[PDB]
Paper text:
Crystal-specific properties such as the size and diffraction quality of individual crystals also influence the indexing process and therefore the measured overall efficiency. This could explain why the PepTSt samples yielded generally lower indexing rates than lysozyme. We attribute this difference to the crystal-quality variation between chip 1 and chip 2, as only chip 1 was used for rotation data collection. Such sample-to-sample variation is common for membrane-protein microcrystals. The prelocation method was successfully applied to both the conventional MX data collection with rotation method and still-image data collection by serial crystallography.
Residue numbers in the entry: 5 to 270, 275 to 413, 423 to 477
Write the structure that this text describes.
Amino acid sequence: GKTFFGQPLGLSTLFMTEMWERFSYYGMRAILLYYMWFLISTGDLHITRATAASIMAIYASMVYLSGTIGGFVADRIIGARPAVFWGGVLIMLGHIVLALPFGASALFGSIILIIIGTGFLKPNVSTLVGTLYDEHDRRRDAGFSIFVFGINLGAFIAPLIVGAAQEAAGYHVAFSLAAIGMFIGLLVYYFGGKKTLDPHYLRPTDPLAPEEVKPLLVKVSLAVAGFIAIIVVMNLVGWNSLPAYINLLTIVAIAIPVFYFAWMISTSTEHLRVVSYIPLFIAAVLFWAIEEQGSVVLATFAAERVDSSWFPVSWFQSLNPLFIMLYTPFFAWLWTAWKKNQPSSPTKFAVGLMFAGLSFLLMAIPGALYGTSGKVSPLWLVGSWALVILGEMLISPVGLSVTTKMMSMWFLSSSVGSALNAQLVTLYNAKSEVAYFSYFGLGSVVLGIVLVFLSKRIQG
Ligand SMILES: CCCCCCC/C=C\CCCCCC(=O)OC[C@H](CO)O[C@@H](O)[C@H](O)COC(=O)CCCCC/C=C\CCCCCCC
Ligand SMILES: CCCCCCC/C=C/CCCCCC(=O)OC[C@@H](O)CO
Ligand SMILES: CCCCCCC/C=C\CCCCCC(=O)OC[C@@H](O)CO
Ligand SMILES: CCCCCCC/C=C\CCCCCC(=O)OC[C@@H](O)CO
Ligand SMILES: CCCCCCC/C=C\CCCCCC(=O)OC[C@@H](O)CO
Ligand SMILES: CCCCCCC/C=C\CCCCCC(=O)OC[C@@H](O)CO
Ligand SMILES: CCCCCCC/C=C\CCCCCC(=O)OC[C@@H](O)CO
Ligand SMILES: CCCCCCC/C=C\CCCCCC(=O)OC[C@@H](O)CO
Ligand SMILES: CCCCCCC/C=C\CCCCCC(=O)OC[C@@H](O)CO
Ligand SMILES: CCCCCCC/C=C\CCCCCC(=O)OC[C@@H](O)CO
Ligand SMILES: CCCCCCC/C=C\CCCCCC(=O)OC[C@@H](O)CO
Ligand SMILES: CCCCCCC/C=C\CCCCCC(=O)OC[C@@H](O)CO
Ligand SMILES: CCCCCCC/C=C\CCCCCC(=O)OC[C@@H](O)CO
Ligand SMILES: CCCCCCC/C=C\CCCCCC(=O)OC[C@@H](O)CO
Ligand SMILES: CCCCCCC/C=C\CCCCCC(=O)OC[C@@H](O)CO
Ligand SMILES: CCCCCCC/C=C\CCCCCC(=O)OC[C@@H](O)CO
Ligand SMILES: CCCCCCC/C=C\CCCCCC(=O)OC[C@@H](O)CO
Ligand SMILES: CCCCCCC/C=C\CCCCCC(=O)OC[C@@H](O)CO
Ligand SMILES: CCCCCCC/C=C\CCCCCC(=O)OC[C@@H](O)CO
């Protein structure tokens, strides 16, 4: 019968929904840093470029952190299908805000809308993909990989289209194209979903029992009052600059996994089978930090150290999803052409971190060889993204499987690694380039070597 690459036809609806949301997301992040540079250059935004780079990292950290709770809100309160829709509406409003004739005053409102909207949408679109298959259907893994291909496709064409529009018609038009991309996703999702999506998911599947409402409200109210209390204390003692608020979000983002690990210890049955995952969680954090610096540090390098006079420099951001799409069929082959081998997940995470470290070590070569005052070939960045995505092909598909032996924890390692970036990327500039690349690249390599050592002990 009529299928979508052998899958239920409803997959095409969710395929396009996420392809256009990712288009709106990565099209925005391909030019947002340069947009802040521009506002700084005109005197409208009064921050350093180091702070702007820090804003990009904590922005990503909050988006992934917001995705850790969006599944709960849909499953218990509003439903998975309304969560995707209203999440898409909030994302669209987030980009419209940047298309309005405002300046730096609109940056915070746009960031908040997209953080909340992406938290509602991203975890619950993947959830809706699963609802196309029951628990016995073997097509589940094939349908998700096709779904992932739509993710990378939108992430691939967005910097090309949006980056070109910025260079031709300016930032406001470019951001409006991101808003239009999400709008297209809303049209296809709304009318397409009504035809093929199970109406059971218009409502929460585990709605709150009557006695559960109050303790949740107490739990939410205590968290907001405490967070607001901290901001009050900060302004009393003088810690009220934008870097101080970024440091607050950094501490909050890192304190979540460490508190969820400190009292997770207190049953020797898996007392140490949970300590097992910690050398792997720290490995995932450091890999995601390197990977998410491509839109910050490597975006800075592309704009300042690469002779890219004949094409928009935001196009470099397409190399990340391009290498993902090129690598995946080879690794799908490898993970079943090598049935006999299938090396251990702790070794996969160890080697994956070493490739990420090799991507930065490679970036230290041109500055050490030619100096940092000139311009170098774009192929240096191509080789860097080739190496780091090779590290992703190891840790990303096996990643959720290690901790199970929830994607929120893998939303979480991305948030912590991106929160770590909010501190580190302020260290990057033309004078620190070689030392920044060489030492964070070397440190990432040796931490992949100690993990290979520890890998024998971890498997138990
Ligand atoms: C069948 C698939 C095999 C793919 C594996 C090979 C990787 C692909 C291409 C490697 C090309 C090597 C670099 C070429 C080179 O040396 O540049 C020559 C060029 C002359 O016009 O000159 C230079 O001007 C350049 O400025 C000099 O600087 C360098 O070349 C330093 C290069 C950085 C080191 C890279 C060396 C080896 C990378 C191999 C990676 C393989 C990993 C596969 C998992
Ligand atoms: C999607 C971004 C990847 C771009 C990769 C481009 C690969 C280019 C390799 C050759 C190095 C740049 C050559 C510069 C060049 O030829 O310019 C033409 C001439 O007008 C001098 O500017
Ligand atoms: C006005 C500014 C508000 C911005 C909203 C951003 C909200 C971001 C995050 C809030 C959720 C934090 C709690 C996340 C959490 O603890 O879940 C982790 C857990 O699921 C691990 O599996
Ligand atoms: C109108 C206010 C903004 C939109 C409301 C949604 C704001 C995001 C989160 C509010 C807290 C909801 C409860 C989240 C929660 O308890 O997460 C628990 C965590 O274990 C999830 O698995
Ligand atoms: C700025 C935009 C304001 C909001 C415009 C859209 C509101 C118009 C009608 C409400 C539609 C709500 C549909 C919620 C929903 O669950 O949709 C799921 C989708 O699969 C269709 O069932
Ligand atoms: C429980 C709450 C967890 C904390 C979530 C709060 C995250 C809220 C906002 C993060 C935005 C990052 C900073 C935005 C920013 O700096 O832009 C404004 C700046 O350009 C104005 O000069
Ligand atoms: C379909 C409903 C949501 C999608 C967004 C709809 C509005 C998008 C674009 C309308 C025009 C965008 C504004 C362009 C603009 O004003 O910037 C250009 C000009 O101000 C600078 O010279
Ligand atoms: C200044 C530019 C306009 C700013 C407001 C843009 C809002 C325009 C349209 C709202 C689109 C709602 C989502 C699109 C959609 O498919 O909704 C269908 C649903 O509402 C039908 O019941
Ligand atoms: C930051 C501001 C957030 C404002 C909205 C956050 C609300 C968080 C917790 C309160 C949830 C109460 C929802 C009650 C509900 O819908 O269920 C009622 C019913 O199912 C019980 O029988
Ligand atoms: C539950 C216990 C509450 C105790 C306080 C918890 C939060 C403690 C410290 C938060 C500090 C925010 C980040 C530090 C900071 O503001 O740095 C300031 C510095 O960069 C110059 O302003
Ligand atoms: C999440 C619970 C409600 C919290 C209400 C208070 C939220 C206030 C700040 C959240 C963090 C964003 C801080 C970014 C910021 O405001 O920078 C302003 C900048 O001008 C510093 O002077
Ligand atoms: C008993 C609980 C386990 C032991 C406590 C572990 C510490 C818990 C939370 C601290 C989060 C790490 C500090 C965040 C960080 O490294 O950045 C600091 C920087 O932003 C301040 O300028
Ligand atoms: C071939 C694939 C992996 C690529 C990484 C291989 C290169 C490994 C390390 C290169 C970094 C060399 C750093 C040299 C250096 O820092 O010198 C310092 C001085 O020359 C610059 O200030
Ligand atoms: C198989 C990987 C190919 C070789 C990778 C090893 C690359 C090691 C260093 C990068 C080239 C070194 C550039 C020369 C250098 O750093 O010296 C500069 C300094 O001595 C001048 O004062
Ligand atoms: C799996 C792929 C590993 C990548 C290997 C690392 C290769 C990285 C950089 C090679 C730099 C060669 C650039 C020389 C070049 O062709 O352009 C000449 C330049 O002067 C034009 O601007
Ligand atoms: C098990 C949880 C994983 C925790 C991974 C994060 C590691 C903990 C703290 C990292 C602190 C990074 C501090 C960066 C730093 O101080 O240098 C940058 C600073 O100059 C920014 O102004
Ligand atoms: C020599 C240390 C053990 C080697 C472990 C293998 C690590 C992979 C490639 C070698 C990386 C060499 C990095 C050289 C380096 O960091 O120099 C720092 C430079 O800034 C000082 O000249
Ligand atoms: C064990 C968990 C590792 C997570 C954190 C790893 C890095 C932690 C702190 C780094 C801050 C110290 C910065 C060292 C440094 O000088 O780098 C800057 C240099 O390369 C350029 O000047
Ligand atoms: C300056 C030298 C650069 C090249 C050295 C890098 C390779 C050297 C040693 C790597 C293997 C060290 C031993 C690791 C090992 O086999 O531990 C056993 C482990 O597999 C059991 O889980």
